[PDB]
């Protein structure tokens with residue numbers, strides 16, 4: 533337990549910390565006793581059986597004063613939602629394509645290991661200092677036994693796939709719907725229906741037509757078609773992560789270096805208000 537120097541709360545329940553001897557910066561989540569501890573092991577187990585630079589790594593865990601502290605990989609730039617909040621600016625298409633290419637590679641890896649993240653949103657896509665996006669928060673992630681369906685209506689309402697809500701079976705492409713809602717969230721700062729009660733939105737996601745941009749005239753043909761390919765209400769006709777990595781919006785992404793200015797800006801704003 534005293535092998536880490538726990539520092540400020542990141543952003544919740546995650547803290548910045550330093551592994552005292554190696555000097556390495558880690559992110560530690562504080563989990564209470566009354567939590568569903570079988571679900572916490574399921575969360576840690578999914579993280580352990582993942583080995584990808586596009587998925588947040590698990591380092592270990594410890595008990596302190598009845599709490600379970602889960603040690604994980606620290607991403608210096610924060611979440612894409614933190615960067616949008618910090619700068620008070622939505623993301624331009626060039627930024628969205630680059631971040632979403634890495635997110636799709638994480639999704640591709642997870643789905644190949646027959647796992648559904650179930651909570652894809654800008655808040656759970658984390659960027660490192662270099663600009664590499666990683667999937668984080670496997671607290672609601674489900675495991676598929678074979679090419680099998682899941683029935684748990686779980687996730688966050690505005691980002692949930694219609695078939696998850698409909699209670700019919702669902703597989704890995706439920707995350708592709710969430711990716712589409714997230715792409716709109718990065719472009720507009722909020723997902724569709726964000727200013728409506730989340731239980732009212734849950735009710736209309738399967739009956740309403742697939743969401744589109746609030747101002748479609750500002751976005752390119754590629755970004756609007758990418759979002760259209762993500763938001764297909766019928767999961768059997770929804771594109772997989774492997775296919776979306778070939779879509780022009782993603783195939784044409786610029787390198788991670790184009791994110792340097794937003795990362796520097798967001799980090800400078802975080803540091804300036806800390807003092």
Ligand SMILES: CN1C(=O)c2sccc2N(C)c2nc(Nc3ccc(S(N)(=O)=O)cc3)ncc21
Nearest residue numbers: 542543546559604606607608610614668669802
């Ligand atoms: C381990 N991890 C997570 O699983 C998740 S998933 C959703 C949130 C987290 N948290 C908070 C984290 N914050 C970080 N890095 C980090 C770095 C900077 C900032 S900032 N600049 O907004 O203060 C926030 C988080 N790195 C990693 C995580």
Ligand code: NA
Nearest residue numbers: 651652688691
């Ligand atoms: Na979500």
Ligand code: NA
Nearest residue numbers: 724744745746
């Ligand atoms: Na929209």
